[PDB]
Symmetry: D2
Subunit: 268 residues, 4 copies
């Protein structure tokens, strides 16, 4: 009956009820999965959000820049799911880039310390989480990360585009490691969705250009997408992540699935 019945899945990246990770968790629970959630920094606020999910799920703290949190993660997950049990899926829905690396801030003015922090959180941490969690994953398992197609340069995304290009490369090497465990590793390249990162990181960096730039982004995406695109609806993206967490894409690994309305395949 449920697409993920009997599956134990770790979902990182919930910060608000608009987070892509919130919708992934909601859809996964609706489909029978038992979740373990991870949150960063504002744990009291995150628990208030995760209480809105269909079912209870333990929340563990994880700052991906914190070596101690990573070294303890597998043990804390095992305590949450019970000794002897393993995870079937892991969702990396994490990203960050300082303001200097985004929007109308000049591309050449982002200092390396800022870009490095963004690449650490947005790309290297996909390898860090796989390293910590592969030893407690079952064969047939699935690791999924979130991508924003960085094949071409574009306005505002700036250094986050470089971090996503690095993340696509990391995913191909993580697939080589995960294959030793019978585990798949893939990214879902989503179209634009109204989340806290889009408003607070992207929107805040666009300044007086946010209104026009985001309208043109939204309109162009919906126009290029042969089936349209609704930036207010994360459900099609959440369903796609759940398809990769399921047993229905068993031969796909080190790859990118586009949940973008088909926009990347069209010029206009």
């Amino acid at each position: 009956t449920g697409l993920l019945d009997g599956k134990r899945i770790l979902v990182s990246g919930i910060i608000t009820d608009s987070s892509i990770a919130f919708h992934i968790a909601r859809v996964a629970q609706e489909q029978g999965a038992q979740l373990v959630l991870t949150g960063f920094d504002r744990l009291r606020l995150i628990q208030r959000i995760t209480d809105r999910l269909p079912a209870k799920a333990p929340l563990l703290e994880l700052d991906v820049q914190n070596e101690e949190h990573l070294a303890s993660l597998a043990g804390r997950v095992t305590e949450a799911i019970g000794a002897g049990n393993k995870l079937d899926g892991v969702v990396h829905s994490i990203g960050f880039m300082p303001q200097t690396g985004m929007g109308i801030n000049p591309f050449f003015d982002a200092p390396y310390a800022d870009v490095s922090k963004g690449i650490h959180i947005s790309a290297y941490s996909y390898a860090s989480m796989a390293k910590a969690l592969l030893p407690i994953m079952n064969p047939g398992g699935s690791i999924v990360g979130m991508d924003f197609d960085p094949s071409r340069a574009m306005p505002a995304y700036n250094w986050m585009t470089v971090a996503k290009s690095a993340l696509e490369s990391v995913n191909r090497f993580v697939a080589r490691e995960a294959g030793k465990y019978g585990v798949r590793s893939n990214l879902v390249a989503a179209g634009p969705i109204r989340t806290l990162a889009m408003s607070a990181i992207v929107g805040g960096a666009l300044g007086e250009e946010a209104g026009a730039q985001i309208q043109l982004l939204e309109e162009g995406w919906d126009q290029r997408a042969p089936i349209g695109w609704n930036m207010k609806d994360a459900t099609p993206v959440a369903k796609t992540v759940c398809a990769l967490l399921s047993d229905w894409l068993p031969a796909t690994t080190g790859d990118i699935i586009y949940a973008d309305g088909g926009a990347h395949t069209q010029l206009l």
Copy 2:
């Protein structure tokens, strides 16, 4: 069932090893009601499809025959009932004359041979979509079979060119299908022992067929981080069923790789 209540047309069954046979079997296991299409050997195809878990009507369809295409939607509507439409369409059809394959020199394939292969293998994806889109429901899905042609390779020769054209046709079919709320995608599969692999590819390789196919399988399984078994079409069938389902609703004009991850590695 993943496809409960869905009405899906599946083309391309010729034997019980056909990729379409496994797609049809998995779709039926998942609750789909099928309409099947077959080319030329209707008596053999009926005997083969009697091995599927459930009954399904078999319609004749030669994609080079304009009359078959012009009458196809009406014949499908008769099989599924007036007022009912399809939710899914699977194109699992290919052909290339021997001159366009194997050890036969690339430059020696005459255009009449290449053209026949492009007609059946690439243009017909647009033909089947033209015939069936008027009888598809919104939220529907059209899926075609691909073999990654982004880089030249031994033996695949002109079939590589037909698949490159098929990928381009798929992106334009997605533009037309979107007007109906329908998705169009290809599944690029790794190598599977089928009649086309043995008769068409192996036939054109001559004395080197066994050795070249062994080298292809071993190399594919090595490159693929999760391995690859050419004797098992089930992972490819499951991937097609995922695209026919409501679980990839935002993917269109695209290519899903069901190849063990081989295309992403060296």
Copy 3:
């Protein structure tokens, strides 16, 4: 001269706006000795090729005509003199019937029309390489013209499919050409005002031809970091001459984009 001493065959001249006319002009300015091929209206084509800076023999070549292809190497050898070989070949040929283009419905193009377009626009790149590789020197270069078909777009319709096929053919021609020490590559150009743009692409757009080309050009120039001028074929002709030269000796089966960098960007 970049091409001093080189003997190069250039197909595809029909008007003095043809991308092939500008490739031939820049190649002659750079010291190359040319052999030209033309289709159908050879008397008219000779009057156009008389506008080039230097004389060049003009040969008839309809790429759908097996007899023309079978005699081509002998006719080229007669034009350049026995004992000499070609260093370069330029394929700057394309055609698609109206049904396969513009506002005409993508599904209404009959296969006979699409097949004719694929024959002329893609298979012929393999035909010309088959006919001419036997009379090419090591270090030589075959160049074809492409229009980036990696993503679908309005109006280009079935010509996009033909260019996707041409890209795949080019990778296989590189395998054959490598046996002769010859490179094979395509140049994916941005939009240039030529007879095919006006008569074929524009012809199939009905009343929207002007609006569509102006919007295509504006968007292309905006997206291209160095800009794009659709009235100037010289940057494209120079790129083809770079591939015909000895300065890209390790590039084959590939695509070089002379499009202002538009394909690598979004606006």
Copy 4:
């Protein structure tokens, strides 16, 4: 006469006479270019090596991680070429990755501080040099960087593959900035060449397998390449860089030219 007659070009990345940058400089000088060279750390060795070039060229110190070197670079180059003169070309031929990020060292065991150093030198510095040098470049100018095709994961290249994926993305954004000055930015993806980085960095990280792994790489590359490939010959790569520095690829920017014998377009 010369392909680069009258052009003033800065060339970074010479360490030995096998460096790709040494062959780029030699071919550029044979084609009439006037060079300014930059070197890192081993200036006494670099000066002796550059004395083997066909013509004299000033050598300037440049450590791309040193902010003071980058801030003074344009003034130092202007002093070398004369006030009132500007550069027509810039060649970035710089790369580094700590041993943990390469060879048989496990992908997951490379600490972020090591990956970050490698990404700083190998990818971010392409944007650093463009920021420093664009104010002193003429319209019609050209910036070229060196790439190794990272579109697919492969043995041994490990985190350097991630740095090159990031560099390709950086190049597309440097093209947007360089276009404001009428300057092109592109990468050359070269096949394998026996250089100090190949022997000391890649070979060093392969341990006891260095000889066999490099032999298989060379043999396979030459087999896949329709026109073949010679790892002992950097001249085809140097000529390709000179073609991009010339006026003969005037409409190509934010792009990647493959000087790899055509290997990337084939399977065998």
